[PDB]
Write an enzyme that holds these catalytic residues in place. Structure first.
Site, mmCIF file in Angstrom:
data_model
loop_
_atom_site.group_PDB
_atom_site.id
_atom_site.type_symbol
_atom_site.label_atom_id
_atom_site.label_comp_id
_atom_site.label_asym_id
_atom_site.label_seq_id
_atom_site.Cartn_x
_atom_site.Cartn_y
_atom_site.Cartn_z
ATOM 1 N N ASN A 12 -8.336 6.219 3.092
ATOM 2 C CA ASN A 12 -9.103 6.967 2.097
ATOM 3 C C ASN A 12 -9.858 8.184 2.629
ATOM 4 O OD1 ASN A 12 -11.860 7.377 0.551
ATOM 5 N ND2 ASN A 12 -10.346 6.680 -0.936
ATOM 6 N N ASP B 196 -5.764 8.416 -1.042
ATOM 7 C CA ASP B 196 -5.345 7.529 0.032
ATOM 8 C C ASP B 196 -4.087 8.124 0.667
ATOM 9 O OD1 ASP B 196 -7.391 5.676 -0.789
ATOM 10 O OD2 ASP B 196 -6.064 5.103 -2.439
ATOM 11 N N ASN C 205 -7.447 9.424 -6.502
ATOM 12 C CA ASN C 205 -8.456 8.598 -7.147
ATOM 13 C C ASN C 205 -9.398 9.452 -8.006
ATOM 14 O OD1 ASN C 205 -7.526 6.208 -5.573
ATOM 15 N ND2 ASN C 205 -8.648 7.136 -3.853
ATOM 16 N N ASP D 279 -13.416 9.488 -7.941
ATOM 17 C CA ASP D 279 -14.224 10.110 -6.908
ATOM 18 C C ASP D 279 -13.482 11.284 -6.301
ATOM 19 O OD1 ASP D 279 -12.323 8.495 -5.564
ATOM 20 O OD2 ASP D 279 -13.686 7.960 -3.952
ATOM 21 N N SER E 219 -10.989 11.264 -4.478
ATOM 22 C CA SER E 219 -10.507 11.045 -3.124
ATOM 23 C C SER E 219 -9.025 10.751 -3.217
ATOM 24 C CB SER E 219 -11.251 9.886 -2.469
ATOM 25 O OG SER E 219 -10.922 8.668 -3.109
ATOM 26 N N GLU F 272 0.842 -1.181 0.000
ATOM 27 C CA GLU F 272 0.000 0.000 0.000
ATOM 28 C C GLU F 272 0.881 1.236 0.000
ATOM 29 O OE1 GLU F 272 -3.497 0.439 0.215
ATOM 30 O OE2 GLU F 272 -4.221 -1.577 0.610
#
Length: 131
Positions: A61, A54, A47, A50, A52, A36
Site C-alpha cells: 500500500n 496497492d 483505493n 484514501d 492510495s 492479492e
C-alpha cells in the site's frame, strides 16, 4: 512485468528467505501472493477512499509503505517509489513484504490473507514444488 507460476515463485521466495520469516511459512506467503495478485507482479489496485493504491505481487500500500507521488498524507516507510514494486525482479517487493510483517500486525495487515488464508490449511500452495 510478468506473472509467476506457483513453484516458480516458491523457489524465488525460499531463495529470498521468506520461509519462516517472522514465523510466516512459505505457504502463507504463497496464499497471500495469490489472493492479492494472482502472482501478477504488475498488479495494481486503487483505493478511492484514501486515494492510495496497492502495488505489485504482495500489494504493498502507497499510503504508508512506498511513495507513488499521489497519495494523501503518504508516509514512505520503505523509502522507495512504488514503481519499483512492479518489476519482474521481486527482490524489492519481498523487502517491503518483510518490512510490513516486522510491524505488530504482521501478516494480518493484509485483508485478503485474513479472508482466504487465515484459519485454513495452506500446504497446497507449496505441494509439488519441491522446496
Amino acid at each position: 512485468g510478468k506473472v509467476f507460476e506457483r513453484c516458480e515463485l516458491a523457489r524465488t521466495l525460499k531463495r529470498l528467505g521468506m520461509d519462516g520469516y517472522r514465523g510466516i511459512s512459505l505457504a502463507n506467503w504463497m496464499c497471500l501472493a495469490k489472493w492479492e495478485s494472482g502472482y501478477n507482479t504488475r498488479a495494481t489496485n486503487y483505493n478511492a477512499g484514501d486515494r492510495s493504491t496497492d502495488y505489485g505481487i504482495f500489494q504493498i500500500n502507497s499510503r504508508y509503505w512506498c511513495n507513488d507521488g499521489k497519495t494523501p498524507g503518504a508516509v514512505n516507510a520503505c523509502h522507495l517509489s512504488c514503481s519499483a514494486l512492479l518489476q519482474d525482479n521481486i527482490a524489492d517487493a519481498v523487502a517491503c513484504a518483510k518490512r510490513v510483517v516486522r510491524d505488530p500486525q504482521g501478516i494480518r495487515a493484509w485483508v485478503a490473507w485474513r479472508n482466504r488464508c487465515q484459519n485454513r490449511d495452506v500446504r497446497q500452495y507449496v505441494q509439488g514444488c519441491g522446496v
